[PDB]
Write a protein that binds this ligand. Sequence first.
Ligand code: CN3
Ligand code: 8PE
Ligand code: HEC
Ligand code: HEC
Ligand code: UQ6
Ligand code: CN5
Ligand code: 6PH
Ligand code: 9PE
Lengths: 385, 42, 54, 126, 51, 431
Amino acid sequence: MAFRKSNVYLSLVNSYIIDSPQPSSINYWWNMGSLLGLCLVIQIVTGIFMAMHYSSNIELAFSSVEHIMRDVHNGYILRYLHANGASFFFMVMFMHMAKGLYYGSYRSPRVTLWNVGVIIFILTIATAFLGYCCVYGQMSHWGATVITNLFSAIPFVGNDIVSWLWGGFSVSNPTIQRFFALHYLVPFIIAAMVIMHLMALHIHGSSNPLGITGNLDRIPMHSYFIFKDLVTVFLFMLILALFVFYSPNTLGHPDNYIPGNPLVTPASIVPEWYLLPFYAILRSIPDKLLGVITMFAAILVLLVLPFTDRSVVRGNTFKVLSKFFFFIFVFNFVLLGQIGACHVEVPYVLMGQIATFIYFAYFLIIVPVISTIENVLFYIGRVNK
Amino acid sequence: KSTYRTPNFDDVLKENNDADKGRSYAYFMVGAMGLLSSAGAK
Amino acid sequence: SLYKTFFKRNAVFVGTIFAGAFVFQTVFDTAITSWYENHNKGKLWKDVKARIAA
Amino acid sequence: PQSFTSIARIGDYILKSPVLSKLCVPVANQFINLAGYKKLGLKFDDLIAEENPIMQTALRRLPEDESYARAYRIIRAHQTELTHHLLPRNEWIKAQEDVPYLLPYILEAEAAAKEKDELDNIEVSK
Amino acid sequence: TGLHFGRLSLRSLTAYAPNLMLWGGASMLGLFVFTEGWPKFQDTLYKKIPL
Amino acid sequence: AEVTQLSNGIVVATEHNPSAHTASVGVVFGSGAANENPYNNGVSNLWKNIFLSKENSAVAAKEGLALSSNISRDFQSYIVSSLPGSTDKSLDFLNQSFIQQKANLLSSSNFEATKKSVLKQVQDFEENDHPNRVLEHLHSTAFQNTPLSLPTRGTLESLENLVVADLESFANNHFLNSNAVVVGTGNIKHEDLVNSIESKNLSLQTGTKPVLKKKAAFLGSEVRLRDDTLPKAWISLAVEGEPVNSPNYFVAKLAAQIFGSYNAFEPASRLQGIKLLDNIQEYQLCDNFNHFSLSYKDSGLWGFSTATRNVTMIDDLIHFTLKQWNRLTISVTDTEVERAKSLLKLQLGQLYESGNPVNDANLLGAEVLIKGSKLSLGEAFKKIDAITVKDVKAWAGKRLWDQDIAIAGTGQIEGLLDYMRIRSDMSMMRW
Ligand SMILES: CCCCCCCCCCC(=O)OC[C@H](COP(=O)(O)OC[C@H](O)COP(=O)(O)OC[C@@H](COC(=O)CC)OC(=O)CCC)OC(=O)CCCCCCCC
Ligand SMILES: CCCCCCCCCCCCCCCCCC(=O)OC[C@H](COP(=O)(O)OCCN)OC(=O)CCCCCCCCCCCCC
Ligand code: HEC
Ligand code: HEC
Ligand SMILES: COc1c(O)c(C)c(C/C=C(\C)CC/C=C(\C)CC/C=C(\C)CC/C=C(\C)CC/C=C(/C)CCC=C(C)C)c(O)c1OC
Ligand SMILES: CCCCCCCCCCCCCCC(=O)OCCCOP(=O)(O)OC[C@@H](O)COP(=O)(O)OCCCOC(C)=O
Ligand SMILES: CCCCCCCCCCCCCCC(=O)O[C@H](COC(=O)CCCCCCCCCCCC)COP(=O)(O)O
Ligand SMILES: CCCCCCCCCCCCCCCCCC(=O)O[C@H](COC(=O)CCCCCC)COP(=O)(O)OCCN
């Protein structure tokens, strides 16, 4: 046989990116996976070449970031690529998970793939939070303080857990040093989970935007989806180059260029832009413990998703009401982000509570009821009696 | 020599099998190793 | 059969392992601390604190 | 995960009632022709996901000619979705051709699996 | 002549449950091992004669 | 039905079936294959085939008498069948065959021809009958260096050393008075058989068969007869079972009956009420299996034999079978026990109450040799009805849960793993 098939190392390259049978009807929404892989490689390479100049002391963190942006040759390129690419990493990941919810890729036989995806999502949120605290600006310090006090809400144990996390009594030098070590560490766990994700994908192949089988008309990976992914790679690099070179500090928060001061609290403490729906979910609950439980349940309710989709056809392509309520859900998630960006004021508390309820009601009540009604409507539309 | 004539194991067999004695001694030793491994892992 | 019901279920087997490991940690810590202090009597700091009475 | 006996029971309860049928059969076929699976040249029994062993059984049950027709409708649907067009109006699946052809094979596999599970969990008449 | 099942039998559940209580007990013994040295649990953990 | 029994040194036990059309009359000795040293092994097979020799069968067939014989581990038998009007002829023939003379059966030509025939039959058994030679090696390695390990058929290396002196020495030490039961089954009355034995003399010998120095003891081991030039992989696997005269006899048989037998090619065999079939039918792990509860005088065996062509998934077959065996200790249900009760009533009534009188003669002779009287079938059905789920769980905890096993295999058994994973699979680690 061929050398790409008989060699031990090149057989994986073959069976994953050369001769992988892909369904020939998949559109550009089946390209966000390759795009996330490229953006992860961007994050790791800029992280290494920018962490060769970073000193993680609490008295030397912000000065070393400014040393990168001023004294290091092309260091502004590195930091701006790194932060804005983390923003694009979460945006492409949100689009990828929306592709997962829409076309029904979570359903059987792809439950393992969906669960490893949710694990990757949790690890990526953790990585972004740790790296945002490594800047040690104003928002970095106070966001670390608020999230660890949320961990202090745990009954009978929590204060000692938080003194363990801090490595002291408040967010201090051991906290920033261990956040830098963990933040260097967790992306390699993300890379291992990505390899496990690709294995759980490869044992059944991709889905298709129709929700029927794709075993009939398969076309290879090579040259077809290689050049289709190359198209979206160049578009992604174009938009990233715009938001790096022409308007770099748009997505960030301007308070992060104030150095970390434990005495001055800011006027409005807000995380970076993508953690705002989860921050709104947590802020909508009038309790600390129930708030933390609801914030983690807002990700575990993605795990309870394949067991509630009672639709007998895969994906929302050929269904009306499920497609409508899907876009209700997407614009609700955007409204959660925008509620979280605001203050704790009338009527944003009541709207945050209603928006959290519509989030959990979509994942727990709306999907099974609308899928059951859509099944019975498909049946009685064509069966006569 | 037939395949029904089992060769000599009599130098290495127990003189008394007593299938609770031997299994209890073996599980005692495996449990002692698990005991000290639990202490060391803690 | 007298001890084998004490080994039959794996639940009571690992429960015995964890109970014995708890007791072993406590007793072994106390015993090694006592022997290590007894072997070096006259050199530890509580001995010098007892001798220097001023 | 709807268990076709259940959807068949609900649909037959709707169809056998005159008021419910007169109320929600126009809603039903309005939902069908807004769904737009006809326009890709498909039938609804071509659209049920077939990656569970009971539906795989009901596809082994199927006669040969309907299996070749189903294979052609799937390949023309993939090609039409690939070109991002629709099939011309002469090639759309009409309302009379949208026959529930695979439903009885699916229902007999449902009854077989249900009976196997019940008999696998019986008591005894003491 | 039926049974209460969800692919797991009620007879099977009552057959395993007197062992599952022992599993919970052995897991609590495991936590009692791995959580000493933690001074918050030592308000409870030394009572009879480990002191 | 009724089984009577009387004594004069010999034991006369009958089953008057007045509906049958034949009548089997024969002597059932209490020696078997388990009463031989490993150097005269196969002498019982050779007595079977000199009794079934051509001259002896011809003299039998002159009067319309068909001969039959059987060599087991515990008991031999020598049964003569005839019409129900010829019981005197059958008794006088059996008298002339064993008692009155043995030198005409043990002539030079008859003995050499019979030794040639049994050497041919043992070689044909050794290289062509695979599941039975697997079961014989399973006995040869479960009970090794102990007289219950010897095969009933004999071995080629021992059987070509026998001469007439060993045949006569075995006859003088084992064809005795107290060792024997004369059995009449079929359409004969008990009083007719006793009066006809007392009409003749029919005194076999003085008595007292030699006593074995070593009792049977189970020994967990394995033997692997790997032959890559065979199309299948035959494998038996068993634990120490229950001997006869045990209170756990019917419980051991019902435990064997729970998992039953199976044939993958028969359609009505694939639909049985066994929970092992849901695991075993998916990837076609075996062609057949049967669970056996063998019971001997000193010990017994409980296990299963099987055959498979899926030689790369033998370990999955052993794995799912042994996890099903572990279900007996923990969580065997009531419906499986009721089903095994009904099926064991069925096969036990087929075994004891079939229409063939020679099988009734073999079974009655074995049972009244071992336990002095035959347990009739109604009390057997009451003992089967008395078994509960707790009895099966207690028996499985005593005999199955984490006990040594004995394994024998031949064919393409490379897919069969080591001894230790099969041994460690006897306990689940989850209970
Ligand atoms: C925000 C930062 C994200 C950074 C990620 C960078 C990549 C952005 C990815 C956006 C995306 O993937 O959307 C795909 C969406 C669905 O695609 P489809 O397969 O159904 O359409 C087949 C096409 O006609 C085939 O036509 P063809 O394949 O020959 O060329 C496609 C097109 C390439 O454009 C794109 O990839 C998306 C802009 O080439 C052009 O002619 C461009 C002309 C300037 O494309 C569409 O057709 C638009 C539909 C509405 C989507 C709106 C998105 C709002 C979120
Ligand atoms: C915690 C869990 C994470 C949850 C993530 C929440 C959502 C994150 C938001 C990411 C945006 C992703 C948008 C949804 C992506 C899937 C949409 C899609 O699949 O496009 C196809 C859809 C219908 O196309 P068909 O496949 O049905 O066509 C078959 C032809 N018969 O075509 C369409 O219907 C039009 C698609 C237009 C997309 C509009 C996107 C709006 C983005 C928000 C804008 C915010 C500003 C207001
Ligand atoms: C050393 C390896 C390294 C890796 C790998 C890495 N980063 Fe970072 N990241 C850093 C460093 C150093 C900083 C702090 C310097 C800075 O912010 O410019 C940082 C900062 C960040 C920031 C804050 C940027 C800012 O200035 O506000 C975000 C957000 C972030 N990382 C996200 C990610 C994500 C998401 C990934 C991958 C999934 C990732 N990082 C991988 C090194 C790394
Ligand atoms: C929470 C959901 C989810 C997250 C987050 C996620 N994945 Fe996926 N991924 C999926 C699902 C579902 C599929 C298959 C969907 C289908 O084919 O219908 C998939 C498919 C893929 C594919 C195959 C191409 C494709 O688009 O289907 C790649 C490559 C991939 N993922 C990589 C990644 C990488 C890299 C990350 C981030 C490190 C990631 N995924 C994060 C759920 C997820
Ligand atoms: C479903 O079909 C597939 C598919 O099967 C695959 C695999 C992919 C591809 C997906 C990926 C490749 C994502 C997987 C991503 C990873 C495994 C991340 C790997 C990245 C790293 C391990 C980090 C990179 C590390 C280096 C390059 C080391 C070198 C770096 C430095 C800094 C050394 C420099 C030092 C000196 C002194 C010069 C697809 O896109 C795809 O859809 C078409
Ligand atoms: C579109 C992007 C283009 C950019 C170009 C860069 C992209 C590079 C992508 C390379 C992807 C390779 C990583 C995939 C991977 O590691 O998976 C290995 C899993 C193999 O297991 P399997 O899939 O069951 O294969 C079949 C195996 O079971 C065969 O058994 P055995 O031979 O033992 O193999 C097991 C390998 C063990 O290694 C790992 C990591 O699992
Ligand atoms: C690990 C990082 C993952 C990132 C995801 C990237 C997915 C797309 C990868 C594109 C690889 C293109 C190789 C095609 C090829 O070799 O075809 C070769 C030859 O094709 C070419 O020469 C393409 C022209 C050169 C394009 C160079 C693109 C480099 C920019 C890459 C930017 C992203 C890293 C085989 O082509 P043929 O089989 O049709 O004859
Ligand atoms: C991030 C990876 C995580 C783990 C996933 C594993 C996938 C690895 C993908 C690597 C793809 C590129 C590897 C190309 C190497 C092919 C060359 C080759 O196989 O020739 C090999 C020899 O390889 C070597 O000597 C050096 C290999 C070092 C590779 C280090 C990268 C030829 O050996 P051959 O297959 O012909 O066997 C004949 C036996 N005498």
